Design a binder for this molecule. Structure first.
Ligand SMILES: Nc1ncnc2c1ncn2[C@@H]1O[C@H](COP(=O)(O)OP(=O)(O)OP(=O)(O)O)[C@@H](O)[C@H]1O
Ligand SMILES: Clc1cn2ccsc2n1
Length: 519
C-alpha cells in the first residue's frame, strides 16, 4: 500500500572526529526521512562509515594502533553522536562488516568474469587525503627536477599528491559514456542543483573518461580480490557499494534490495558528486541494476579559512553545541542557517541569535503567553473553536493554509531554510495577533467573552500548525507543546490535520504549570 522511499547519507571516513558539516548532512537526511514518514511513505534511511583505504590506515598508524581497534573506538563515538542527534536511521553500515565485504568481492569477481575489468598498469598521481587519481597536467604548483615533474598538489584540495606506478585492475568506464549521457537526457532532475550537472559534463565527461584503476597492490587495508589476493579494491568502488550491500544485494536475502532499490535520494556535499553521478551509475549499468533517481549535493559549512575539514582542523564539534545549548537548538541552526545550494559561514554569534530569538523567544514565549492567558481568563479551560469571528481571522486562517502550501513546496525541493523561515513568518504573525486583538482589553468587558474565547482558540490552533510542521526538524519541542496544550488525539499531530483550520472544537484543559519548552 505505502510507496517506498530510500534515502542515504555518504559513508563518512572515520579519519578524525566528525564536525558540524557531517552533522548537517545527517540531520538533513533525517529531516527528509521524518518528513516522508509523516507523508505516509515506507521510509528506509541509511548512514555509515567508509573504513578502508590508505587514508584510514594512515590515521590508525598515526594513532599507534591497528586499523580495527582504531576503527571500533571511532565508530563507537560516531554511533553515540547520531543517538545524541536523534537520527532516525534504520541501519548503520560499516565497510569492515562481512555482509559488505562479501558484496564487494562478488561485484569485483562478476565484472572480472564479464571482462569489464582487466589487469594492467597504472602510472600517474594519487592524493591519499582525497583518495583520487590525477594526471600530470591536473597538478597544481608542480615541482620540476631536471625537466620532469616529480611532485605537486591536488587541484581539488591543495594536498600533496604522490607518484604511483604499479600493477592495477582497470574498469573500462569509457564504453558506458554514451549511455550515461542518454540517461542524463532522459532524467533531467538527476543531479541537484542544476549547476553541478554542467560541472560534471564539461569538466569530466566531455574531455574524455579515462579507464578507472579499480584496484591496487601497494597497501593491504581493504577488500582483497579473491582471484588475485595481492590486489586491494579501490576505496571508492568499495564505498559506493554500501548503498546496495546494506539492502542484502547478492546475499541469501535480497528482500530489502527488491523493495527499496533504486534509491530516491543520495545526499552529499559537492566534492563527491563525480563519484555518485559518473562512476556510480556506470557501475550499476555494468551490474544491470536500476540507477538512483536523484543525487543531491549541498554546499559547505565555511569557517574563517574556507571549507570546514577534519583533516585541516578548523572545526566545530556538535557534542559541544548539544551539551551546552541543547538538541533542538543544534538541529534548528544547521537547517535554518545553511541554505542547501549555498556555502554558509559558521559564527557562534549567529548560533546564539537563532537559539535565543527564534526558538526561546519567538516560539517558546508565544506558547507561554498563550497558556498564561487561558489560565488567567478561562481558568485553564480553552474554549472550543467555532469560526473566524474576529475581523482578522479570515485572513489569518488563509495564511495558515498558505504557510502549509509554501512549506510543502520548499520541503519537496529540499529548501529547508526557506521552509523554516516560512514557519517563522507564521509564528511571528501569531505573536502580532496577540498585540492586534489585545485580549486583556476584551477580558474587561463581559459582553466580549465569546470574542475572547475565539482569540484564544486561534492562538492555540496557530501554535498547533507550527508544532506539526516542526516535527521533522525538532525532536523535543513539538512533543512538549502538545503535552502542555493537552492535545492527545494522535490525528491532530499529523500533516492531514492541517488541511482544514480549527480542529479543536471541544473545550480542553491546558497545563496549569506552564514551563519554558526550550533549554
Ligand atoms: N564543511 C562541510 N559542509 C558540509 N558537509 C560536509 C562538510 N565536510 C564534510 N561534509 C559531509 O561529509 C562528506 C565528506 O566526508 P569526509 O569523510 O570526506 O569528510 P571531510 O571533513 O571532508 O574529511 P577530511 O577532512 O578528512 O577530508 C560530505 O560529502 C558531506 O556529506
Ligand atoms: Cl559512498 C561514500 C564514500 N565516501 C567517503 C567520504 S563521504 C563518502 N560517501
Amino acid at each position: 500500500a505505502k510507496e517506498t522511499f530510500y534515502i542515504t547519507t555518504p559513508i563518512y571516513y572515520p579519519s578524525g572526529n566528525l564536525h558540524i558539516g557531517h552533522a548537517y548532512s545527517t540531520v538533513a537526511g533525517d529531516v527528509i526521512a521524518r518528513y516522508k514518514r509523516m507523508q505516509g511513505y515506507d521510509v528506509r534511511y541509511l548512514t555509515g562509515t567508509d573504513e578502508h583505504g590508505q587514508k584510514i590506515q594512515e590515521k590508525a598508524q598515526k594513532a599507534g594502533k591497528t586499523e580495527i581497534e582504531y576503527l571500533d573506538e571511532m565508530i563507537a563515538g560516531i554511533k553515540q553522536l547520531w543517538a545524541k542527534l536523534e537520527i532516525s536511521n534504520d541501519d548503520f553500515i560499516r565497510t569492515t562488516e562481512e555482509r559488505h565485504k562479501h558484496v564487494v568481492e562478488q561485484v569485483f569477481e562478476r565484472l572480472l568474469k564479464q571482462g569489464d575489468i582487466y589487469l594492467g598498469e597504472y602510472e600517474g598521481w594519487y592524493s591519499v587525503p582525497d583518495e583520487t587519481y590525477y594526471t600530470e597536467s591536473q597538478l597544481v604548483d608542480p615541482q620540476y627536477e631536471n625537466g620532469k615533474i616529480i611532485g605537486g598538489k591536488s587541484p581539488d584540495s591543495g594536498h600533496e599528491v604522490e607518484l604511483v606506478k604499479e600493477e592495477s585492475y582497470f574498469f573500462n568506464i569509457s564504453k558506458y559514456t554514451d549511455r550515461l549521457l542518454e540517461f542524463y537526457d532522459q532524467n533531467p532532475d538527476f543531479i541537484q542543483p542544476p549547476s553541478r550537472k554542467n560541472e560534471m559534463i564539461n569538466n569530466f565527461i566531455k574531455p574524455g573518461l579515462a579507464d578507472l584503476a579499480v584496484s591496487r597492490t601497494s597497501f593491504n587495508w581493504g577488500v582483497h580480490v579473491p582471484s588475485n589476493p595481492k590486489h586491494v579494491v579501490y576505496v571508492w568502488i568499495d564505498a559506493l557499494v554500501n548503498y546496495i550491500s546494506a539492502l542484502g544485494y547478492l546475499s541469501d536475502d535480497e528482500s530489502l534490495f527488491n523493495k527499496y532499490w533504486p534509491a530516491d535520494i543520495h545526499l552529499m556535499a559537492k566534492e563527491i558528486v563525480r563519484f555518485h553521478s559518473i562512476i556510480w551509475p556506470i557501475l550499476l549499468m555494468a551490474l544491470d541494476l536500476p540507477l538512483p533517481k536523484k543525487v543531491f549535493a549541498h554546499g559547505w559549512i565555511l569557517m574563517k579559512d574556507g571549507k570546514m575539514s577534519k583533516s585541516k582542523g578548523n572545526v566545530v564539534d556538535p557534542n559541544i553545541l548539544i551539551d551546552r545549548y541543547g538538541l533542538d537548538a543544534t538541529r534548528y541552526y544547521l537547517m535554518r542557517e545553511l541554505p542547501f545550494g549555498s556555502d554558509g559561514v559558521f559564527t557562534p554569534e549567529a548560533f546564539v541569535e537563532r537559539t535565543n530569538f527564534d526558538l526561546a523567544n519567538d516560539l517558546g514565549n508565544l506558547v507561554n503567553r498563550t497558556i498564561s492567558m487561558v489560565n488567567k481568563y478561562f481558568d485553564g479551560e480553552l474554549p472550543a473553536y467555532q469560526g473566524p469571528l474576529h475581523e482578522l481571522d479570515e485572513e489569518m486562517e488563509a495564511m495558515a493554509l498558505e504557510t502549509v502550501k509554501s512549506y510543502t513546496e520548499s520541503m519537496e525541493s529540499l529548501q529547508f531554510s526557506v521552509a523554516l523561515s516560512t514557519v517563522w513568518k507564521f509564528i511571528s504573525r501569531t505573536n502580532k495577533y496577540i498585540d492586534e486583538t489585545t485580549p486583556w482589553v476584551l477580558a474587561k468587558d463581559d459582553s466580549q467573552k465569546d470574542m475572547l474565547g475565539n482569540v484564544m482558540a486561534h492562538l492555540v490552533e496557530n501554535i498547533r500548525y507550527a508544532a506539526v510542521l516542526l516535527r521533522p526538524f525538532l525532536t523535543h519541542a513539538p512533543k512538549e507543546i502538545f503535552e502542555q496544550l493537552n492535545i492527545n488525539n494522535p490525528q491532530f499531530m499529523e500533516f492531514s490535520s492541517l488541511e482544514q483550520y480549527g480542529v479543536l472544537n471541544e473545550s480542553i484543559m491546558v497545563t496549569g504549570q506552564p514551563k519554558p519548552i526550550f533549554p
